[PDB]
């Protein structure tokens, strides 16, 4: 499909970004396993430090996914756009 | 009240500066002097050109001519009168349609009497008065049938209100036409009039002052001329419109009158008319009263511009101009035909 | 009673805002668009 | 311990903030769509710089989303009823601040887009003119946001 | 020059969004002969190309507010400093199990305890991010950090009128001017700013 | 004239029905049923307050907002002609947005002052947590209101030292001296809001 | 019982459904017909 | 007290010693002294005025603040979730409309809007300390018809 | 336990929201239809364009749909009043705010459709317009989504 | 348990909904009517297409009416209220909506057909304005049902 | 609301119906569409009343 | 003891005296610029003669401001509520009664310049009837200085 | 062995007779200076005679500074209320009685003013007219009087 | 046992007499006065007599005066209620009663003296006109009258 090189070059733009911060999230939380400490708690919080570094990791893997999506997303872009 | 100075900028904000400052640019006392040290028509050209006005007869004949001149002011204050016309809400458009239609009156006489004697819609068209325009059909292709032009008038012209004096074709055949224009008139000054107190605020107080006069001049100057002609003393009061000083009580005595001084001895009773039968010595070599009355009209509707929360500054502004206009074709006038001791007939607009 | 603390305070902020919804809707209502453009 | 009716008021500051910032914007957006299909006409090629004062509604109507989520979420079950005042005034404050902001973007938005095709050198001018319409705004937006922390 | 983007800067203090602006700059100045040697009958564009290196210095400066703020897409900046308190004391000082009844509580952390304090290296501790209380913290600071920095940068616009007096040999409109009216400014706004500090 | 008719119509329904509502507890010898303490009382000082600083903030920025346009509209058409009108008259929207500012400044210092009260019962509770709310009520309408009159007056000025420059440069001075004393009217409600939250307390 | 609340509720249902129905009808009374076409030669 | 020690100067002695030096040397001494006193209050009055326009700096750089607290919290972080694919595909597209809307509202419009705050400062309170008066567009010869 | 007549606001929440959204999306496709009808009879290639701003309004009118059914579908007998405040303030948010909305709509429809007959480069400008009108009804409706499930 | 009055709210419902939409009906025909009339006189071959507007308008009547009798037969003294209060909401809504979908049919059928009559090409464009207004009352009927049934 | 119907179209009915006589019928159909609407509230009336 | 609620009425007087002074300044200082600004522009040389009216209506302004700031220093918390009617009273009395002498302020004032700009021997006739506006502006002070005082 | 709040209603008469008495005596004022303004341009000598109007209407602004003034002075705390209606009827009686009789006052010299121009003759008909309004305004001063005495 | 508020009612009667008697007279003198300064521009001679409708005017006033004096004089503490119903019905009696008279007084002068100006055989029909007026006036003090001995 052309869709318009204009149109995949926003793509390919966007799937920069997704990828770059998406992976960022995940290594922030790695690393620190932190301020933002916005994993997706639960609400019955018990006193279990290892909680956090468990949902830590479950934060990296779901972000890692969504930069993955924007791997494919960039590539079929970059195709569209070098060939329009 | 208090109804003015608030909401009217909110939509005529834009209209009120642009008119005023289109006014500024009106030719000045000093400007007309530059004008009249000319004797020439190319040089009343080039000194005009030192103002807003000029670069209008650029690529037309090299001869300049008074007819050239004369079109070419009317055109400008046209389009510039379009201009605000088209930017403008029914609330004060309304207003300004009152102005078109006075010209549209002219108009559509003319376009009666050349339909009566088989004249051409397209023969009439070119020379009626800009702003009547009369962009609607069936008044188009009337097939010089009367029929056909008063149907399309009551229907799709504005003016249909007006032609309800006039009617059933009858009286387009009948009346004089002059008779039926002044008729007219009147139901349009009597409407606008009213219209104008409706919008009972800083406009009614305003601009009635001038319609008022307007009406007073229409009863006095009809009554003088009228002595030479032939028309019936109850026939002529007919036309006397109501909005003014005169309806009240005076208007009897114009319509008894067959002189001249039973005319004056009416003004005698309002002194802001007794002044100017005084002041139109009407020798021969000054002023007439007509002369007296344009130069009135100028001052009340330059004391126009001292409110600025109205519409009356619109209808002045149209009518200012148009003395203007013929300011300056008059002064074309005593070049081209070299009266240089008459140049001074120019009505100031300050 | 006719009117309790809660209704009559809840009345009293209900018409201030009225008052404000009525002042905008007013002026929006009283709009209006061009009857014909300028030019072309 | 808490007055019943206490959250009404909280809830409806939340409203307000956002209708009356939405009908500021949208008559500003109203009045300048106008000036701008009559103006766009004769010179089309203004059309683009016309779109400003709309932006600038646009921002007011942001103004109003801000104050309205902000209090959205700090709404609660057990509210104290003075929170709740707080809350009320804020949308208050903000909606009427961005209603009147509204009405100056759109009014001059339309002077300023016939204004301006007829003399740009007024361009500069007319954003000024909202520019400090979106300022006053911004006041709204201000004290709707301090009144949360009090 | 400087003192437009560093208003700018304090007026979009983003550290995120600093970088996204100053590669659109960048994507510009890369076009730049392509788009200087072209057409471009698109004003809009023409414009902010003109301003192409307006924009990228501006990005520039919001980079550094907004690293100091430690503000990037609502993310703070960590760099091992946090040490404003001291959570196990928090503990010792009788609060045992306090995240039992915490599930329905926050708790403010108190001052001068001590076993709290020391500043944050470089901008706000990133510990004031994730509070509740940011909204007193640090509109505080901004506040009275506007308020400073409005009046001296007026105060240097003052300043500069006296170089202008100079050059047009007016003593007079330093005389009665800017002596009188600096001595004003300084006498309110400046006393009112050392009373911050 | 179908809203103004529909605005005349509540109106005078509105107070029809007060005065016979009034006049009847009267002529039926009601026990003061209609008991104006009791409606203040139980009104929370809390409303009172967050009204008044709200009005306080908004009734000056619609003050302002209303003269920006009066004189944005009469500058942007006038200067088609008259450019230079730019260069000074711009100071007629920067006493506009001072008259705002007066009220912004007092908005924030009157909310500084807002307390709970952990209050309940009004017997004997609050004596002066209800002169300062009414207190801060007023200082906020004063004010309110004060700077909402000044910005229509700045406007209509403004207006006409625009329509004036574009056609004299040398009227420009001169009428700034108009649009002083309209904001000096702003300062005098300033003044009078100070004074009556100079000597309140909440809490 | 709760009359302060029955009270409130009919008082303003009814009164605001009123005056939509009042508006709604002067509304439909005033419906401008053009006055125009086949009406100025009725007329 | 000294505030209003050296108001005096600058109200009104600027006129009274042109005065004194006019009538010396031999100049509208009224209208002089209106120019100074309209002067004298907007330099007075406008720094406290200017003083609240610079509160602009706060304002805006707090509403952004708002944006982006909010636009996170409401977009992204409800897109997170504790179960894995759902949680990482739902971040994709979640993430790809909050990046739409931190360019549409804060990098444009916001960017934007900052833009001509703080050249509004430039322009009324920095300017009016110093850079007064007009002059004339410099248009010199140039070959400029080169295209 | 639960205070009585707590359902009444619920109640006035899903139909303020699509009656006050059918005003607007009413409006904007009145106005805009009028602009049509005038317009396409000299400009008939333009006729499947210039409908733009009545489906714009359709959104409007979905826009409160949406919350509406939301509400209703979100009522019971035994309701805290808490949730009660919620709905209206969520119907009314989403309904008055697309009502504005549907004004901006139908004058910038108007204007726009005629103008684009004018001038058909005005064809782009009308939408992004109607797009602005378009986003501050989004608004609304992201509000009332936040409040009703809060 | 039964609150007294209960009942009268779901009475006021089923009127509501009937009175409404009868109004919005009846200014769609007669609007629409009128310019049938002037149509007519200049050319009659296009009275039997023009009618839709009206056919339409008696649509939503219908949407009322439906909505009023399933009211009516949900009536009964010994009311939980809670449905007494759906009911009103349900009456209004299809009322107030379908009235507000009836102007809009009268004013775009009016335009439609005046138009229609210099040019046959807008009859297609007509129609479809009119599916929208007649997708507004739908929406309105919709939510009703939902509330009355719930 | 049917009273209105019938009267505004009956005033452009009657009097557009003289300037084109083939409007008669359409005049009527549409004076029938008002009629329905009045019957509607007769409808409702008799079932709510009788319940 | 000292009741609840009595420094009520001081309050609304304080506040009464300012507001409606301010709206008589505000109003005769508006019509007042006006007219001379119309004035100026056809001949200059009568604006120095035309400022007087300009601070007539300032006087109202001070003369609400001496009355507002006299009560609002006297306001306390221990009103003995007969103190707080006297306040009521004096604040509307000069506040009211400034009102309407603006408003004759404004009226005066505007006609005096242009009567001026036609004839400048006006001048003192029209500063003598602004002169009776001023003493109506008096009277109210001098009641409401007189009741503060009981 | 008075009832409380009795105060409230004689306060409201001082101030009512002085407000509307400045009402009253200002619109008068207003009109009247208005016609001097526009006659004296055309015949300025007239300037000196034609204030009178404007004095007649200081009349009725003192009719209310006087019963305003003698209200105040009676005005206790221990007032039996009986003599509280009694003074409220006093201030009302005068203060609305010269509202009247300002307007006539004003409008009788707003015509007579510019008919005196044009007919010297009026200038007796003028004062007597005046006369009448002065006596008019006289009656409600007379009723004033009677009643805060009784 | 003398009900309180009993001398509420009975001193707005006193004051209803006057004020509403001096509004219609003022009325009537204004209409008055401005015809009859019109009408002397062309009839000087007849001026004096044309001030019958003001001095008419008046008579209403007195009307009111006798009235509002009888029942001030009549006022006192202990009322029996029953007296100042009677009161109050005799005050708005007469006021209301010459109220309206006031405006016939106006409107019949108006035309009958601009009309003498044209007829002089008008004026014996005016002046019976006004008589009738005039008869309708005594109407209101008669029933008044007896109102307030009963």
Redesign the interface.
């Given at each position: 499909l052309c869709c318009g090189p204009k149109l995949a070059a926003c793509g390919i733009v966007?799937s920069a970004?997704?990828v770059i911060?998406?992976i960022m999230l995940g290594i922030?939380f790695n690393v620190?396993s932190?301020?933002?400490?916005?994993?997706?708690t639960?609400?019955?919080?018990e006193?279990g430090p290892q909680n956090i570094y468990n949902?830590y990791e479950?934060?990296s893997?779901?972000?890692?996914?969504?930069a993955?999506?924007?791997l494919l997303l960039g590539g079929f872009s970059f195709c569209q756009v070098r060939l329009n | 009240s208090f109804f003015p100075e608030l909401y009217f900028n909110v939509d005529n904000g834009y209209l009120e500066g642009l008119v005023r400052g289109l006014k500024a640019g009106v030719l000045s006392q000093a400007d007309y002097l530059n004008l009249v040290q000319c004797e020439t028509l190319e040089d009343l050209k080039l000194h005009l050109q030192s103002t807003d006005y000029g670069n209008f007869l650029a690529n037309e004949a090299s001869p300049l001519t008074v007819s050239v001149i004369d079109d070419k002011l009317k055109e400008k204050m046209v389009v510039e009168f379009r201009h605000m016309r088209n930017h403008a809400y029914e609330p004060l458009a309304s207003f300004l349609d009152f102005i078109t239609y006075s010209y549209m009156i002219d108009n559509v006489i003319l376009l009666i009497t050349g339909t009566l004697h088989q004249r051409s819609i397209a023969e009439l068209v070119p020379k009626c008065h800009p702003l009547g325009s009369f962009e609607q059909m069936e008044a188009v292709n009337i097939a010089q049938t009367p029929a056909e032009l008063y149907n399309a008038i009551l229907v799709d012209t504005p003016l249909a209100a007006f032609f309800q004096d006039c009617i059933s074709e009858q009286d387009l055949d009948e009346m004089n036409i002059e008779i039926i224009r002044n008729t007219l008139y009147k139901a349009y000054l009597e409407s606008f009039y009213k219209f104008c107190t409706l919008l009972g605020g800083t406009t009614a107080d305003a601009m009635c002052p001038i319609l008022e006069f307007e009406a007073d001049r229409r009863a006095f100057i009809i009554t003088i001329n009228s002595f030479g002609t032939e028309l019936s003393k109850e026939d002529r009061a007919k036309l006397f419109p109501h909005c003014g000083r005169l309806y009240p009580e005076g208007l009897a005595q114009l319509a008894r009158a067959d002189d001249y001084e039973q005319v004056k001895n009416v003004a005698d009773y309002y002194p802001e008319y007794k002044l100017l039968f005084e002041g139109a010595g009407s020798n021969p070599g000054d002023k007439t009263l007509e002369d007296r009355f344009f130069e009135h009209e100028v001052k009340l509707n330059k004391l126009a511009f001292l409110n600025q929360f109205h519409f009356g500054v619109f209808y002045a502004f149209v009518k200012l101009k148009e003395q203007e206009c013929r300011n300056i074709v008059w002064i074309a006038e005593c070049i081209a035909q070299r009266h240089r001791a008459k140049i001074d007939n120019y009505i100031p607009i300050f | 009673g006719f009117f309790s603390p809660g209704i009559w305070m809840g009345l009293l902020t209900t018409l201030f805002m009225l008052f404000i919804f009525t002042y905008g809707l007013h002026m929006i209502l009283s709009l209006k668009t061009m009857d014909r453009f300028d030019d072309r | 311990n808490n007055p019943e009716y206490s959250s009404f008021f909280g809830v409806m500051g939340a409203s307000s903030a956002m209708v009356f910032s939405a009908m500021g914007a949208a008559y500003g957006t109203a009045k300048s769509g106008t000036g701008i299909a009559a103006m766009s006409v004769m010179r089309p090629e203004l059309i683009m710089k016309s779109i400003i004062p709309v932006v600038m509604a646009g921002i007011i109507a942001i103004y109003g989303l801000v104050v309205a989520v902000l209090i959205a979420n700090s709404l609660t079950d057990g509210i104290t009823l003075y929170r709740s005042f707080l809350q009320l005034g804020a949308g208050l404050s903000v909606g009427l601040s961005g209603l009147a902001a509204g009405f100056a973007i759109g009014i001059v938005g339309d002077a300023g887009v016939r204004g301006t095709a007829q003399q740009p050198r007024l361009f500069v001018g007319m954003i000024l003119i909202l520019i400090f319409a979106e300022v006053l705004g911004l006041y709204g937006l201000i004290v709707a946001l301090i009144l949360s922390t009090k | 020059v400087i003192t437009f983007p560093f208003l700018f800067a304090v007026m979009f203090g983003d550290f995120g969004h600093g970088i996204l602006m100053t590669l659109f700059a960048v994507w510009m100045v890369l076009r730049e002969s392509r788009i200087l040697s072209q057409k471009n009958e698109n004003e809009m564009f023409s414009m902010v190309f003109s301003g192409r290196y307006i924009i990228l210095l501006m990005g520039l400066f919001s980079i550094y507010t907004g690293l100091i703020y430690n503000d990037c897409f609502s993310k703070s900046l960590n760099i091992f400093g946090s040490s404003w308190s001291v959570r196990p004391m928090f503990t010792i000082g009788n609060w045992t199990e306090e995240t039992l009844l915490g599930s329905s509580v926050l708790q403010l952390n108190p001052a001068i305890p001590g076993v709290f304090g020391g500043p944050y290296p470089f901008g706000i501790d990133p510990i004031w991010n994730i509070a509740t209380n940011k909204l007193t913290f640090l509109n505080s600071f901004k506040m009275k950090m506007s308020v400073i920095l409005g009046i001296i940068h007026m105060l240097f616009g003052v300043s500069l009128s006296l170089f202008n007096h100079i050059y047009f040999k007016k003593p007079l409109n330093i005389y009665f001017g800017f002596i009188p009216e600096i001595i004003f400014m300084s006498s309110l706004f400046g006393y009112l700013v050392i009373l911050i500090f | 004239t179908g809203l103004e008719l529909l605005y005349l119509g509540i109106f005078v329904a509105f107070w029809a029905c007060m005065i016979v509502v009034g006049i009847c507890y009267t002529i039926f010898d009601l026990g003061f049923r209609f008991d104006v303490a009791w409606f203040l009382t139980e009104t929370s000082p809390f409303m009172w307050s967050n009204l008044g600083i709200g009005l306080a903030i908004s009734l000056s920025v619609v003050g302002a907002a209303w003269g920006i346009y009066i004189t944005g509209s009469s500058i942007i058409g006038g200067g088609v002609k008259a450019p230079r009108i730019k260069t000074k008259n711009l100071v007629s929207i920067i006493f506009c947005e001072a008259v705002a500012i007066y009220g912004i400044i007092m908005a924030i210092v009157i909310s500084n002052m807002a307390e709970p009260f952990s209050a309940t019962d009004p017997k004997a509770i609050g004596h002066r947590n209800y002169h300062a709310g009414y207190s801060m009520f007023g200082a906020g309408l004063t004010v309110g209101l004060s700077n909402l009159f000044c910005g229509v007056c700045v406007g209509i000025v403004g207006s006409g030292a625009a329509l004036a420059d574009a056609q004299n440069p040398s009227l420009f001075v001169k009428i700034l001296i108009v649009e002083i004393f309209g904001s000096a009217i702003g300062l005098f409600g300033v003044i009078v809001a100070i004074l009556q939250t100079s000597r309140v307390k909440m809490g | 019982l709760e009359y302060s609340v029955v009270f409130n509720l009919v008082l303003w249902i009814m009164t605001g459904l009123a005056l939509a129905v009042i508006i709604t009808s002067y509304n439909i009374w005033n419906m401008d017909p053009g006055y125009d076409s086949i009406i100025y030669r009725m007329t | 007290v000294v505030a209003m020690l050296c108001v005096p100067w600058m109200l009104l002695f600027k006129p009274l010693i042109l005065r004194h030096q006019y009538l010396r040397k031999k100049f509208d001494f009224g209208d002089t002294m209106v120019h100074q006193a309209i002067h004298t209050i907007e330099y007075c009055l406008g720094c406290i005025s200017n003083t609240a326009s610079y509160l602009r700096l706060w304002a805006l750089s707090l509403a952004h603040a708002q944006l982006s607290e909010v636009l996170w919290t409401m977009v992204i972080h409800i897109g997170l979730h504790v179960r894995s694919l759902a949680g990482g595909l739902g971040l994709f597209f979640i993430f790809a409309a909050f990046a739409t809307l931190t360019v549409a509202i804060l990098l444009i419009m916001e960017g934007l809007s900052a833009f001509l705050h703080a050249l509004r400062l430039h322009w009324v309170e920095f300017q009016n300390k110093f850079y007064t008066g007009t002059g004339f567009k410099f248009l010199p010869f140039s070959f400029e018809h080169i295209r």
């Open positions: 966007l970004w997704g911060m998406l922030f620190h932190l301020i933002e400490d916005v994993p997706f639960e609400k019955d919080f006193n949902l479950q934060v893997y779901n972000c890692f996914i969504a993955g999506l924007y | - | - | - | - | - | - | -």
